[PDB]
Amino acid sequence: ILGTILGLLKGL
């Protein structure tokens, strides 16, 4: 989860 919500933010 911590790499997920953050990785869907740094991948926009």
**Local structure of residue 1 (DSSP, 8 states):** -
Technique used by the depositors: NMR
- Residue 8 has phi, psi (to 5 degrees) of -95, 5
Please report how many Cα atoms fall inside a 13 Å half-sphere around the Cα of residue 3, on the Cβ side: 0
Task: Tell me what percent of the chain is helix, strand and coil, each rounded to the nearest 5.
Answer: 35, 0, 65
Residue 2, classed as helix, strand or coil, is helix
Burial 1-12 (b: 16+ CB within 10 A, else e): eeeeeeeeeeee
